[PDB]
Amino acid sequence: VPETRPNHTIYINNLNEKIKKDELKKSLHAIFSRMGQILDILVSRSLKMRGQAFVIFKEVSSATNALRSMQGFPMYDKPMRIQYAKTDSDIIAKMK
Numbered sequence: 126v127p128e129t130r131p132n133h134t135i136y137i138n139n140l141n142e143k144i145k146k147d148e149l150k151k152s153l154h155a156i157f158s159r160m161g162q163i164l165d166i167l168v169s170r171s172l173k174m175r176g177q178a179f180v181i182f183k184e185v186s187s188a189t190n191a192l193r194s195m196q197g198f199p200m201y202d203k204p205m206r207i208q209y210a211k212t213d214s215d216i217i218a219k220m221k
């Protein structure tokens with residue numbers, strides 16, 4: 126079951142795996158900066174992290190609006206799947 130506690134960070138998957146890391150981050154920043162101020166965007170090249178990304182917002186209200194408003198938003202011909210990131214995700218701690 127996905128995380129139900131609102132997190133500053135949203136977890137995104139089903140991203141187009143053809144796009145390189147830096148371009149994916151620039152596009153995500155363009156789409157999600159409209160939900161609120163972004164502190165960081167985490168993308169890994171690892172094999173188990175492809176098609177996935179984290180967006181860390183300065184305020185939970187921005188993350189919540191992103192989750193409710195950008196769910197299924199089509200990018201690179203693929204609808205994004207968004208969840209609240211796991212509370213104190215081990216992945217975020219290492220990546221940030």
Ligand code: NA
Nearest residue numbers: 193194195196
């Ligand atoms: Na919606």
